[PDB]
Amino acid sequence: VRRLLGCLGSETRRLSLFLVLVVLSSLGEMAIPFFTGRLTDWILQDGSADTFTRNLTLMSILTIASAVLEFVGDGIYNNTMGHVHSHLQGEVFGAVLRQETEFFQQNQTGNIMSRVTEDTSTLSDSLSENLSLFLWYLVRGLCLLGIMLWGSVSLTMVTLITLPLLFLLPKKVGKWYQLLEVQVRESLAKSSQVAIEALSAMPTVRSFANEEGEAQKFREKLQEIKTLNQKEAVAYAVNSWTTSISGMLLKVGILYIGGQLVTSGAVSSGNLVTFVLYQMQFTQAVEVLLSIYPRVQKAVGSSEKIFEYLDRTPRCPPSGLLTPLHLEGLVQFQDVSFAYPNRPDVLVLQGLTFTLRPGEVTALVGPNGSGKSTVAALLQNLYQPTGGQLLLDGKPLPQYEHRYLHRQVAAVGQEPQVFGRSLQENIAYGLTQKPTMEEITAAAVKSGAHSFISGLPQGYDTEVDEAGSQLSGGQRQAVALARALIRKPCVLILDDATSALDANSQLQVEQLLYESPERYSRSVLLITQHLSLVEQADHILFLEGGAIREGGTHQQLMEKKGCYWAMVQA
Amino acid sequence: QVNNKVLMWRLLKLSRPDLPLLVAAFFFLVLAVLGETLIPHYSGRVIDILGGDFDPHAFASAIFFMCLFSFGSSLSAGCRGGCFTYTMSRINLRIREQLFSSLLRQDLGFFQETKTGELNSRLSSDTTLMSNWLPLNANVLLRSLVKVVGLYGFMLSISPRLTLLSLLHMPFTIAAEKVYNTRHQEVLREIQDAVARAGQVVREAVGGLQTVRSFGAEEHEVCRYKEALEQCRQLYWRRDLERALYLLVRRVLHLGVQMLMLSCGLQQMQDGELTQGSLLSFMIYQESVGSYVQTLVYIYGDMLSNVGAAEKVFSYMDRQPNLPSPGTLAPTTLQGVVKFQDVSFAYPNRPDRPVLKGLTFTLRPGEVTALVGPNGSGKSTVAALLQNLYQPTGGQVLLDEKPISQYEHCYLHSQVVSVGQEPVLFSGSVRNNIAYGLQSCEDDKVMAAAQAAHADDFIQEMEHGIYTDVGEKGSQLAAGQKQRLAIARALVRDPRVLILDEATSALDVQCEQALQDWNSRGDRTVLVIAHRLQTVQRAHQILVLQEGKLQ
Ligand SMILES: Nc1ncnc2c1ncn2[C@@H]1O[C@H](COP(=O)(O)OP(=O)(O)OP(=O)(O)O)[C@@H](O)[C@H]1O
Ligand SMILES: Nc1ncnc2c1ncn2[C@@H]1O[C@H](COP(=O)(O)OP(=O)(O)O)[C@@H](O)[C@H]1O
Ligand SMILES: [Mg+2]
Ligand SMILES: [Mg+2]
């Protein structure tokens, strides 16, 4: 694969050094059969003894140097593949989070994680082991064939001619083996389906008392299977015979041709000893190489499936480019109609018209199922309006930078979530830098977490689990309000903030919203069903469904005699 | 461990009739091994001849002995592999038949508490992976036992002095493996923890990305994932470093013996106690023993690890049934009376919640009764007690001054059959499903009993015979939605007592089975159950059921 090879491009210097060290180790490893032949011939020739003290020393130095260079080469290759695996897992993770929120839909939680965590590690482990073994044995197979041409020119032609005879016939008869084993496995599944069907209706079987009929029906399929596997045992007997006669008759032909060649005066008897010891090493080198090849062939196709997933393109705009100072904070909604990208054929929102002026309160109340939480998600950059204009200081949301905008607009969800970290880190989550210890306490006092977490023995450094076992419902909403308040945002959105939150915290959130001087620099939007909170709201909107039915202040809506009074008295 | 000993002894006793196949396989394995370790000895004989005065008589005789041992060893190895895979299939067919025959005599509490998918996996797939435990392990074990003895026997014949040099370094290989496997198991625990911490970040970020995207902290999850990847990387490098160091030590220790073996080989063969071909025979022999002794020392651990899959199959076969003790009856003449008193039956699956309370009623040979109940009051529950399908936990059912548990398995159910709201149609033909439960003598009774409901128009219109195939459930049945076929099945066996759970209904126009139309000829009792209170034509007894109570 071109792009997989192009991924491993910066490690060309280390890959070149690894190939050299493998060649130097493979050359030095083939020393013991190559030195057995001369020393045995030297005694039979009645030679001098001034070489035996040196030839054994030289042959031991070579394979010792081959052992170390194998260890150094295996050390480098294991180090470089580790950095590649760590780099590939990081980049496939960052490509996942860059897609739009439509792709997730709270249902791909299992398939995405199997594609990021499970497959990537198993693919790189298969690549790092099979390519290492394929490269090690290919060099050993090539080096042995290089020196077998040197020792003889006739016997090395014989073993190359009969090598396809060794490794093509067992494959062909092997194809006959599971061709008949397919029918045995198929008949085994068919017999089990009959027995299961006769067992699931057991009250019908027990009422008629026909267990002997089911025993005979099960036995008929077993006798047909017993006929079929008798041919299976014959097929393996032929298959196991022909993989063992070709291997051992090859050694006879090598020795007999060598027996004819030695007696002609071409090579000595000791040169045949080296060639005999090279046959068994070359045969296993070929056999290991052929078994490796199905593993790499399948794994390359799996890597092409991950690589096509890597270049998935999103549908949302990437980010913005403008960072201003002295933000106004007013956000204008003008003819905004939104449809869910899951089901674009049905419209779920249309005809919104309001303005969140700075320093005032605009709270919208609607019945159950009216679809108000999708409006608050539309306020930030979670989704996009299909046919409307969303204006924030004269500019749309994608025109602003992703990191700056969400630091300026903070919101809590209908169901707040708690990450498994320290509560000091979870309060200041998402911030560019960690603030001082006093600013966290100032944000926690305003939210009300300091009135409860002071009693905990762990202080502000308590460790919490993955999802809400240590913190209660009141505590989860208490740490959620502190999280959206530490950054001091310009637009604050609360969704069911006081649904389960305690009465003392519903108290001091009211002078914060209505009496505190900090409301002058923010524009707030509330979606709450509590009638004891929207009395001092400057703008009140009614969302019965789809679009706004009516809107106004507190006194105007009561004097109008609309649906707002009817919902209040209920 | 004593838990795996009882399962191994039962599994060994499961292969009792396959002893002649195991003996022949062991005999063919010994001959195949003996042929394999004899060719390298003859290989040293040819090199011995080639280095001296050449004579073609012994050289051709040596080659002819290579061919005779080559055909002999290949035929012995070929017949061994075929015989082993025939035993594997014959063992598999025996355990599968024994399991289903034992499972057919189990109570209905087992078939409703346990899913049918679980029984399918323990019958179709688990017994295939369980049957091949013995032929795979016996082939591996008996190969390494003979070959190690065979090769070391060939060691001592060549050179007793040079054998002991390679016999006194095997503890070095064993000590190297023992110290390496302990360190490798400790590192693997750390890798599993670090890969669990890496997955912890992905549980946090992917599942709650709505909170992450709404605060602009997607780069924080990317940065936090790099720390988890670096810790997994460092542990991966330590695992690869300790593995590569172990291979270097083992290869060096193996080399030092080979250098020492050859150095004593050249010195001994110089003086005249060895030949050139003897050294070649010793070198080829010595490389074979190194791998096979390592398989032999670690076969018991692999065998016990793979044997831990027969617990579920052996528990299903040997579990105790809940059926009561059967007995004999009087099948000479039957008076056709059923008596009932003080039922307090509850399901064994749910003994806490009862279904039927104390009620009594009787069935008469010349009378027909009716049972009416709105819903969930024991409509077909009473019908399950009469046919000995379920046994009461309170009170009993009588049949002419004797209970139902002492009746035999065959004659009681042949005289009492019933039809329900869901008539299950089994695989096969129409004739096989009309006369299900009958051993024989159906070839002269199907044509007179299938025309009970509305003669024959559904079957007579096509194929002009009863041999029309049906298939599985959900098939081409259109005779009143496979209801006409079920009632005609009931009247084949001419039972004395018939229970109709959800008969008549919209097919009450076909009323040839309720009154004298079926019963009242001689003595015959019919029990009728209806959902809505329809007026019982020619009624004799009216019973209305409400929460296990009747008026
Ligand atoms: N991802 C989604 N894609 C498509 N439709 C969705 C999706 N999530 C929710 N919905 C549906 O669209 C509706 C839009 O309503 P929305 O979620 O805005 O209401 P809500 O304010 O959360 O509800 P409530 O009345 O309980 O306060 C939901 O009630 C639900 O039926
Ligand atoms: N197979 C079963 N296993 C356990 N309880 C059952 C079973 N079938 C029915 N019951 C219980 O027995 C009560 C009576 O059911 P019943 O009226 O006999 O059903 P039907 O009307 O189908 O004959 C029901 O309330 C039900 O909860
Ligand atoms: Mg909502
Ligand atoms: Mg019923």
Side-chain angles (χ1 to χ4, degrees), chain B residues 379-381 420-421 501-502 529:
Chain B
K379 311 293 299 289
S380 64
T381 316
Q421 205 186 22
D501 290 353
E502 310 288 344
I529 297 143

mmCIF file of all heavy atoms in Angstrom, chain B residues 379-381 420-421 501-502 529, ligand 4:
data_model
loop_
_atom_site.group_PDB
_atom_site.id
_atom_site.type_symbol
_atom_site.label_atom_id
_atom_site.label_comp_id
_atom_site.label_asym_id
_atom_site.label_seq_id
_atom_site.Cartn_x
_atom_site.Cartn_y
_atom_site.Cartn_z
ATOM 1 N N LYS B 379 -56.660 -21.349 32.208
ATOM 2 C CA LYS B 379 -57.450 -21.937 31.131
ATOM 3 C C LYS B 379 -56.846 -23.257 30.667
ATOM 4 O O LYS B 379 -57.498 -24.306 30.721
ATOM 5 C CB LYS B 379 -57.560 -20.950 29.967
ATOM 6 C CG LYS B 379 -57.973 -19.550 30.384
ATOM 7 C CD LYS B 379 -59.394 -19.536 30.912
ATOM 8 C CE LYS B 379 -60.381 -19.989 29.849
ATOM 9 N NZ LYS B 379 -60.537 -18.977 28.768
ATOM 10 N N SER B 380 -55.599 -23.224 30.204
ATOM 11 C CA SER B 380 -54.887 -24.431 29.809
ATOM 12 C C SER B 380 -54.063 -25.025 30.941
ATOM 13 O O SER B 380 -53.442 -26.076 30.750
ATOM 14 C CB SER B 380 -53.977 -24.141 28.611
ATOM 15 O OG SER B 380 -52.965 -23.212 28.956
ATOM 16 N N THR B 381 -54.036 -24.375 32.106
ATOM 17 C CA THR B 381 -53.288 -24.904 33.242
ATOM 18 C C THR B 381 -53.932 -26.175 33.779
ATOM 19 O O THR B 381 -53.236 -27.120 34.167
ATOM 20 C CB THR B 381 -53.184 -23.847 34.342
ATOM 21 O OG1 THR B 381 -52.855 -22.580 33.759
ATOM 22 C CG2 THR B 381 -52.109 -24.230 35.345
ATOM 23 N N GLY B 420 -54.341 -27.212 21.232
ATOM 24 C CA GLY B 420 -54.230 -25.900 21.838
ATOM 25 C C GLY B 420 -54.388 -24.739 20.878
ATOM 26 O O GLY B 420 -54.783 -24.926 19.723
ATOM 27 N N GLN B 421 -54.087 -23.526 21.354
ATOM 28 C CA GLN B 421 -54.183 -22.346 20.501
ATOM 29 C C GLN B 421 -53.061 -22.298 19.477
ATOM 30 O O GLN B 421 -53.235 -21.724 18.396
ATOM 31 C CB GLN B 421 -54.162 -21.074 21.346
ATOM 32 C CG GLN B 421 -54.832 -19.881 20.680
ATOM 33 C CD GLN B 421 -54.676 -18.604 21.480
ATOM 34 O OE1 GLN B 421 -53.766 -18.478 22.298
ATOM 35 N NE2 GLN B 421 -55.567 -17.647 21.246
ATOM 36 N N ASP B 501 -58.683 -26.906 24.036
ATOM 37 C CA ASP B 501 -58.327 -25.654 24.693
ATOM 38 C C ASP B 501 -58.940 -24.453 23.985
ATOM 39 O O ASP B 501 -59.673 -23.674 24.599
ATOM 40 C CB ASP B 501 -56.807 -25.500 24.766
ATOM 41 C CG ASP B 501 -56.165 -26.480 25.727
ATOM 42 O OD1 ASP B 501 -56.907 -27.184 26.444
ATOM 43 O OD2 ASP B 501 -54.919 -26.548 25.767
ATOM 44 N N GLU B 502 -58.625 -24.270 22.706
ATOM 45 C CA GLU B 502 -59.145 -23.154 21.918
ATOM 46 C C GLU B 502 -59.690 -23.652 20.587
ATOM 47 O O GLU B 502 -59.388 -23.118 19.518
ATOM 48 C CB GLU B 502 -58.085 -22.075 21.697
ATOM 49 C CG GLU B 502 -57.349 -21.618 22.954
ATOM 50 C CD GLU B 502 -58.208 -20.780 23.888
ATOM 51 O OE1 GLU B 502 -59.269 -20.283 23.452
ATOM 52 O OE2 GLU B 502 -57.818 -20.619 25.063
ATOM 53 N N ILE B 529 -62.983 -25.813 26.383
ATOM 54 C CA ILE B 529 -62.591 -24.542 26.979
ATOM 55 C C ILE B 529 -62.884 -23.438 25.973
ATOM 56 O O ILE B 529 -62.519 -23.553 24.798
ATOM 57 C CB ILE B 529 -61.105 -24.535 27.390
ATOM 58 C CG1 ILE B 529 -60.838 -25.586 28.468
ATOM 59 C CG2 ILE B 529 -60.681 -23.160 27.884
ATOM 60 C CD1 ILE B 529 -59.502 -26.278 28.324
HETATM 61 MG MG MG C 4 -54.892 -21.178 26.395
#
